[PDB]
Amino acid sequence: SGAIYVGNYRVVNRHLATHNDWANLVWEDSSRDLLVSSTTAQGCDTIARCDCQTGVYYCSSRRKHYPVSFSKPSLIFVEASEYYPARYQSHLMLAVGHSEPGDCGGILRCQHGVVGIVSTGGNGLVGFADVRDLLWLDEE
Numbered sequence: 001s002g003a004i005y006v007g008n009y010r011v012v013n014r015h016l017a018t019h020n021d022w023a024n025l026v027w028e029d030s031s032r033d034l035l036v037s038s039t040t041a042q043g044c045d046t047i048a049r050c051d052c053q054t055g056v057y058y059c060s061s062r063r064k065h066y067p068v069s070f071s072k073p074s075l076i077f078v079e080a081s082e083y084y085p086a087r088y089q090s091h092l093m094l095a096v097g098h099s100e101p102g103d104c105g106g107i108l109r110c111q112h113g114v115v116g117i118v119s120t121g122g123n124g125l126v127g128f129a130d131v132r133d134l135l136w137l138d139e140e
């Protein structure tokens with residue numbers, strides 16, 4: 001679990017969105033595994049606006065933040081799951097890293113701010129949903 005809190009927005013994995021998230025929906029995209037809802041209180045996270053390919057992510061199944069090198073946002077095949085069928089997840093970045101169902105939500109960040117959230121994983125893999133192209137998170 002986990003979310004990004006920027007301005008009056010809450011960014012979560014679409015597959016983990018609550019009823020309150022759907023009832024206060026701003027935007028959602030199943031191909032990216034992202035959903036944004038509105039919040040009453042202002043958040044403290046800042047979004048990175050950069051092309052970093054190195055950063056650090058939080059892994060709840062290890063209670064640890066790990067430094068990682070990650071690929072550029074791309075269209076990557078994701079294995080069937082209890083959440084989406086075999087499909088191309090878009091705007092996804094991969095890294096070698098520990099991951100477990102439970103971990104989606106964790107923030108990946110660089111020196112500039114939040115880069116994205118844990119969305120997929122593998123045997124020694126973890127995938128990240130990029131948010132750096134969502135410029136509207138910084139306003140309104």
Ligand SMILES: COc1cc(Br)c(CC(=O)N2CCC[C@H](C(N)=O)C2)cc1OC
Nearest residue numbers: 033081083099100101119120121122123
């Ligand atoms: C350790 O191997 C895995 C780690 C993880 Br985390 C996972 C879970 C995983 O990737 N997804 C499940 C939740 C929806 C997500 C999506 N964005 O489509 C895809 C599987 C794994 O293998 C089988």
Ligand SMILES: [Zn+2]
Nearest residue numbers: 050052110112
């Ligand atoms: Zn950066």
